[PDB]
Design a binder for this molecule. Structure first.
Ligand SMILES: [Mg+2]
Ligand SMILES: [Mg+2]
Lengths: 140, 140
C-alpha cells in the first residue's frame, strides 16, 4: 500500500525548518506536506483552496502547532474532532511549553498526543505510541 | 512494497514472550519470525534447515539475544557481519545488562544498536534510530 503524507501545520519559519529536519533525520519515510496557518491546514484536509483535487487521501498524522494566524490551531483541532469526515485522523499537538498542554487538556477534546518543541524523535515516537498509530520498518 | 519480517532470536521462553508482547503493543506492523538458538537463526537467514525455500527475502532487522545454546549469539553476529550476503542486514543486540554491551563493543564488530531487556518501545526505537533504518507511519 502507498504511504500517506504527514501534514505539518506550523506558522513559525524556524520551527518549520527544525521539525522538517528532525523528521528527515529520524528516517521517517512518509512525505511531509506543509501548511503555514489554520486556513491552509483545513483547505488541505478538505481538499480545497490550493489543494483542490490534490492527490486525495487522509494524512497518516497531523502535526498541529497550537498557535496559528487566521485560523488558530485550537480551531483546526476543534474542526477535525467535531467533523464526521475528519475525526478519525490522528493529531499530535505541538506546543512551546508543557503548560500550553494543560490548557489544551482542559478543553476535553480527547487529545492524548503532545510534543513540546523543538521536535525530537523520542518525544515524536512517544506521541505516535500515544495515538495507537501503526508503524513499520522498511528495507527500501 | 511488501513489509519484511523481523527476526527475533531468543532462547529464554519468558524473554521471548515479553519481547513479542512489547512489539505487538507498540503497533509494529512487520510480522515477527522466531528463532530459539543460533542454529535456527542462521538457518533462517540462509534459507535452509527448516526454512528451505521459505518466503525469501532478508529481514528488516534482526533482534539478536546475546547468549544462545548450540551456536552463541556472538557467533551469529560474527557470521552475519563477516558474510558478504548477510552483512547488510541490520542487527540489534539484546542483552541482560549494560556491561554485556561493553564486552560486545570490545569485539569491534561495528554494532551500534543495543537493547537491555525487558524490551520496551523507547529503547527499541532508539536502536532503530542507531541503525539508520527507515520507518513509516501506516493508515491501515
Ligand atoms: Mg505557532
Ligand atoms: Mg539468551
Amino acid at each position: 500500500p502507498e504511504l500517506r503524507p504527514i501534514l505539518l501545520v506550523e506558522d513559525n519559519p524556524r520551527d518549520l525548518e527544525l521539525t522538517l529536519t528532525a523528521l528527515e533525520k529520524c528516517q521517517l519515510a512518509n512525505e511531509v506536506v506543509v501548511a503555514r496557518d489554520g486556513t491552509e491546514a483545513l483547505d488541505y484536509l478538505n481538499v480545497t483552496g490550493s489543494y483542490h483535487n490534490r492527490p486525495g487521501g487522509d494524512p497518516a498524522v497531523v502535526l498541529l502547532d497550537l498557535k496559528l494566524p487566521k485560523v488558530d490551531g485550537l480551531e483546526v483541532l476543534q474542526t477535525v474532532k467535531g467533523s464526521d469526515h475528519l475525526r478519525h485522523i490522528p493529531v499530535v499537538m505541538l506546543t512551546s511549553s508543557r503548560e500550553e498542554q494543560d490548557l489544551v487538556r482542559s478543553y476535553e477534546l480527547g487529545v492524548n498526543a503532545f510534543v513540546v518543541k523543538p521536535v525530537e524523535f523520542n518525544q515524536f515516537f512517544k506521541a505516535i505510541q500515544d495515538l495507537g498509530v501503526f508503524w513499520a520498518l522498511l528495507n527500501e
